[PDB]
Write an enzyme that holds these catalytic residues in place. Sequence first.
Site, PDB file in Angstrom:
ATOM      1  N   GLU A 149       9.462   4.642   2.297  1.00  0.00           N
ATOM      2  CA  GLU A 149       8.745   3.603   3.022  1.00  0.00           C
ATOM      3  C   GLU A 149       9.654   2.480   3.519  1.00  0.00           C
ATOM      4  O   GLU A 149       9.415   1.310   3.223  1.00  0.00           O
ATOM      5  CB  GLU A 149       7.626   3.055   2.141  1.00  0.00           C
ATOM      6  CG  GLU A 149       6.638   4.127   1.710  1.00  0.00           C
ATOM      7  CD  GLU A 149       5.586   3.617   0.751  1.00  0.00           C
ATOM      8  OE1 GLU A 149       5.732   2.486   0.233  1.00  0.00           O
ATOM      9  OE2 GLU A 149       4.612   4.358   0.514  1.00  0.00           O
ATOM     10  N   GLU A 271       3.903  11.664  -0.402  1.00  0.00           N
ATOM     11  CA  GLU A 271       2.976  10.930  -1.276  1.00  0.00           C
ATOM     12  C   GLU A 271       1.538  10.944  -0.744  1.00  0.00           C
ATOM     13  O   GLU A 271       1.293  10.740   0.449  1.00  0.00           O
ATOM     14  CB  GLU A 271       3.407   9.474  -1.469  1.00  0.00           C
ATOM     15  CG  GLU A 271       4.555   9.252  -2.443  1.00  0.00           C
ATOM     16  CD  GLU A 271       4.926   7.785  -2.594  1.00  0.00           C
ATOM     17  OE1 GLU A 271       4.024   6.923  -2.541  1.00  0.00           O
ATOM     18  OE2 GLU A 271       6.123   7.483  -2.769  1.00  0.00           O
TER      19      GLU A 271
HETATM   20  O1  LIG Z   1       1.282   3.517   2.913  1.00  0.00           O
HETATM   21  C1  LIG Z   1       1.378   3.639   1.485  1.00  0.00           C
HETATM   22  C2  LIG Z   1       1.399   2.261   0.822  1.00  0.00           C
HETATM   23  O2  LIG Z   1       0.131   1.644   1.051  1.00  0.00           O
HETATM   24  C3  LIG Z   1       0.106   0.283   0.623  1.00  0.00           C
HETATM   25  O3  LIG Z   1      -1.154  -0.290   0.966  1.00  0.00           O
HETATM   26  C4  LIG Z   1      -1.268  -0.764   2.304  1.00  0.00           C
HETATM   27  C5  LIG Z   1      -1.845   0.349   3.189  1.00  0.00           C
HETATM   28  O4  LIG Z   1      -0.810   1.291   3.499  1.00  0.00           O
HETATM   29  C6  LIG Z   1      -2.473  -0.176   4.483  1.00  0.00           C
HETATM   30  O5  LIG Z   1      -3.245   0.864   5.097  1.00  0.00           O
HETATM   31  C7  LIG Z   1      -3.355  -1.384   4.177  1.00  0.00           C
HETATM   32  O6  LIG Z   1      -3.972  -1.954   5.339  1.00  0.00           O
HETATM   33  C8  LIG Z   1      -5.109  -2.775   5.007  1.00  0.00           C
HETATM   34  C9  LIG Z   1      -4.712  -4.222   4.709  1.00  0.00           C
HETATM   35  O7  LIG Z   1      -3.611  -4.347   3.798  1.00  0.00           O
HETATM   36  C10 LIG Z   1      -5.931  -4.913   4.114  1.00  0.00           C
HETATM   37  O8  LIG Z   1      -5.600  -6.270   3.782  1.00  0.00           O
HETATM   38  C11 LIG Z   1      -7.126  -4.862   5.079  1.00  0.00           C
HETATM   39  O9  LIG Z   1      -6.980  -5.881   6.078  1.00  0.00           O
HETATM   40  O10 LIG Z   1      -7.311  -3.575   5.712  1.00  0.00           O
HETATM   41  C12 LIG Z   1      -6.164  -2.807   6.120  1.00  0.00           C
HETATM   42  C13 LIG Z   1      -6.658  -1.408   6.499  1.00  0.00           C
HETATM   43  O11 LIG Z   1      -6.542  -1.209   7.912  1.00  0.00           O
HETATM   44  O12 LIG Z   1      -2.534  -2.375   3.568  1.00  0.00           O
HETATM   45  C14 LIG Z   1      -2.149  -2.007   2.249  1.00  0.00           C
HETATM   46  C15 LIG Z   1      -1.474  -3.203   1.578  1.00  0.00           C
HETATM   47  O13 LIG Z   1      -0.742  -2.797   0.413  1.00  0.00           O
HETATM   48  C16 LIG Z   1       0.271   0.190  -0.893  1.00  0.00           C
HETATM   49  O14 LIG Z   1       0.445  -1.181  -1.278  1.00  0.00           O
HETATM   50  C17 LIG Z   1       1.454   1.000  -1.423  1.00  0.00           C
HETATM   51  O15 LIG Z   1       1.233   1.275  -2.814  1.00  0.00           O
HETATM   52  C18 LIG Z   1       1.692   2.324  -0.688  1.00  0.00           C
HETATM   53  O16 LIG Z   1       3.054   2.691  -0.956  1.00  0.00           O
END
Ligand SMILES: OC[C@H]1O[C@@H](O[C@H]2[C@H](O)[C@@H](O)[C@H](O[C@H]3[C@H](O)[C@@H](O)[C@@H](O)O[C@@H]3CO)O[C@@H]2CO)[C@H](O)[C@@H](O)[C@@H]1O
Length: 339
Positions: A149, A271
């Site tokens: 990542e 993953e």
């Molecule tokens: O990609 C793997 C990674 O994911 C991490 O979580 C991310 C997501 O990837 C992401 O889709 C998500 O998006 C959301 C956002 O964070 C929210 O606050 C909300 O607004 O909706 C969004 C969806 O469109 O964000 C998270 C934040 O962490 C994991 O943290 C990690 O373990 C993993 O490696």
Amino acid sequence: DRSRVFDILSNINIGWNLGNTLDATGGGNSVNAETSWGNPKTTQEIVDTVNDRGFNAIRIPVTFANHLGPAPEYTISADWLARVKEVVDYAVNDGMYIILDTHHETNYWLKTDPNNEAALCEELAAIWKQLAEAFKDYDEKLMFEGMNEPRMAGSAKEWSGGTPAERKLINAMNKAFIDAVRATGGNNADRVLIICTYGHNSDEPTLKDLEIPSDPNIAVALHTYTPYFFTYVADGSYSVWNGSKKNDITWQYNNIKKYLIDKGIPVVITETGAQFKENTEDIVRWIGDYVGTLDQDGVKCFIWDNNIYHGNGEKFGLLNRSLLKWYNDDIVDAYVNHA
Ligand SMILES: OC[C@H]1O[C@@H](O[C@H]2[C@H](O)[C@@H](O)[C@H](O[C@H]3[C@H](O)[C@@H](O)[C@@H](O)O[C@@H]3CO)O[C@@H]2CO)[C@H](O)[C@@H](O)[C@@H]1O
Ligand SMILES: [Mg+2]
């Protein structure tokens, strides 16, 4: 013609990550980093169990940062290299398919600043040179995944594919990874090298900008905990899987087909998984839709397992490592019997 990678990959049933272990960042320059996040020291018995259950492939995430000497050599501390080798060897003794990566380097030196391209490329190269050298003699079942990542932490688009300038940086870092490994020779010359997108994101703009190396012995890695709100805990997250959201998986897979599979580019989900939310029956159904989508074109995935199930944290645990028993056999059954 990239068919050799497809043949090698086709031998996998389904994979399993040794999560929160060698990737863990406590302990400093010491082998205790392995246990710093509360997991027991990895044993042959643990790997046996993973293999015996049907996970004939294993991803070994490793964070090297704190075990590296100063720039520019970035010498991997001998004790750490030897330990990584031990853990890899567990899987080799069981004739398993193996991915070795670099992991939470993103906490340290791996910050995707386009203006620091050279320094980033050089450090990645210097690490993989040493790793490629140490695993020169290992056969084709051992694969390398250059980065995990890769991203700018805290950046607005950290978790949605970064910026155009960053994605070009990623292409350069991917190229540097491949270059360094191939230059070591031996079995590394045709070893499967697994590259990734920014943050392992699989959105169309992230994929569109992905430069595909001419080297025919590569695969593209992506992380898809899709849909996020089923798999993770958050405001708006849900634990019910009726199939309505299957579309979110389908939609995403088509992009992966569009940009990779239908061009004959090997793809691996290094993953994926769903946190346990007292919802065995739902996760089983999600596994059916999710993995069954990947099985349409023989794409393999590796499930994230951090050994957290009862206690607090992200509940991706599946194997109770201390008891050599599985936390939830219904979920595991769905994974290992996916075909
Ligand atoms: O990609 C793997 C990674 O994911 C991490 O979580 C991310 C997501 O990837 C992401 O889709 C998500 O998006 C959301 C956002 O964070 C929210 O606050 C909300 O607004 O909706 C969004 C969806 O469109 O964000 C998270 C934040 O962490 C994991 O943290 C990690 O373990 C993993 O490696
Ligand atoms: Mg050879």
